[PDB]
Design a protein around this ligand. Structure first.
Ligand SMILES: Cc1cc2nc3c(=O)[nH]c(=O)nc-3n(C[C@H](O)[C@H](O)[C@H](O)COP(=O)(O)O)c2cc1C
Ligand SMILES: Cc1cc2nc3c(=O)[nH]c(=O)nc-3n(C[C@H](O)[C@H](O)[C@H](O)COP(=O)(O)O)c2cc1C
Ligand SMILES: Oc1ccc(Nc2cc(Cl)c(O)c(Cl)c2)cc1
Ligand SMILES: Oc1ccc(Nc2cc(Cl)c(O)c(Cl)c2)cc1
Lengths: 189, 189
């Protein structure tokens, strides 16, 4: 069931590279984004999908130095050890064009774009889990933005929002609690 | 499959009240939100689920007058005709507390909350579609916020983000196009 698929998606930090069919994984990532809704069917999400040498490079040559340099003013090995990383962006050129075309909803489009990033991120995350792969979602933006844009020659208008690290599950998810229903759902007739 | 479930979710404007098991619908809405991820497991989403008389009241006694009064400074019948409306909020008290506890990520929590609203909205939307029900997502916030808060005695800290109108499917979804893969997915090895 769909609810079972949602329940099956979890944050998995212990990731490896025991991935059998990388083509199928890419196809599934694309499909999850394709079938996600966005305001005005604006489809503002953009993805950079890194595996292999590019995966090593992101973590060793971009994230680590950026962090070290920032601090001066480990967990990273765990991210690098994964099969890959999906970097999620939102295309600001499209958001800007929507603000111009429909000045009525100018303030809304940035909000709806942010919601859209959440939407495609979890749809991909859940689709990967259905393949038996684990993932975790990181946020080393805005620190790594410029280096990522330069290395993979990305448009300036792509605004980095999240990095979904994914791979084979090497240890189970931890415990998770849930709020009291009564504190977040009200039903009225 | 999960991808099939995503593809099955569509915007349906022609909605009715031919809903067989309202308890099951409510259970499914709750489960979809429960199993959605949020930053720090903060679970900031809040829902007001309106059916029956409350559904009529929202559209006839709140949305319509607020709109008419705003304009002075139809489609609504189509929304009213649905079985119900799920109003999605984000609890600002929790966001504020997170900003205080982890001042390091103060700027992030509002963003992650917005993403979370997108996340739970589409998970519920898709779960409803799996039950054979249709829905559409509206945004009459912030115009109706105060009236909604007063009528259903909601906490001030609940910030209205979206209204998912749902019910039986009375006409099929319209045509939808998709961007070129090449313009939104980059794969690197
Ligand atoms: C919008 C968003 C931002 C998140 N940020 C991070 C993060 O930066 N680093 C991290 O390790 N997990 C992050 N998480 C993961 C959440 O902590 C996790 O989803 C939550 O604790 C529920 O656990 P689960 O994913 O196993 O269901 C984020 C999740 C969401 C939805
Ligand atoms: C964040 C968000 C905001 C949306 N805002 C509205 C809206 O205010 N009114 C409306 O009728 N549809 C709205 N939509 C519906 C989109 O236009 C619709 O999802 C998109 O055109 C794709 O069509 P589909 O839902 O049939 O897949 C919104 C969708 C999303 C994800
Ligand atoms: O209260 C509102 C009523 C109608 C709209 N118009 C609208 C219509 C569509 Cl199809 C959208 O995807 C979006 Cl984001 C907005 C926006 C706000
Ligand atoms: O670059 C970053 C690395 C680690 C964090 N910490 C963090 C850790 C968890 Cl479990 C979260 O749910 C969130 Cl939202 C943030 C935040 C940003």
């Amino acid at each position: 069931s769909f609810i079972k698929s949602l329940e099956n998606r979890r944050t998995i930090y212990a990731l490896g590279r025991n991935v059998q069919d990388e083509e199928k994984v890419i196809e599934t990532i694309k499909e999850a984004v394709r079938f996600s809704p966005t305001a005005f069917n604006s489809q503002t999400g953009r993805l950079l999908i890194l595996t292999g040498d590019a995966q090593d490079k992101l973590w060793d040559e971009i994230v680590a130095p950026e962090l070290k340099a920032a601090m001066e003013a480990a967990k990273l090995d765990g991210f690098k050890a994964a099969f890959g990383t999906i970097l999620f962006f939102e295309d600001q050129a499209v958001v800007k064009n929507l603000q111009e075309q429909f000045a009525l909803y100018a303030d809304n489009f940035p909000v709806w774009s942010e919601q859209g990033s959440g939407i495609i991120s979890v749809n991909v995350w859940t689709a990967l889990a259905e393949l038996g792969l684990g993932a975790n979602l990181q946020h080393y933006n805005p620190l790594i933005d410029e280096a990522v844009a330069k290395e993979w020659n990305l448009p300036e208008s792509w605004k980095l929002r999240g990095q979904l690290v994914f791979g084979s599950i090497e240890a189970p998810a931890g415990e998770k609690t849930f709020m009291d229903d009564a504190d977040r759902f009200i039903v009225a007739k």
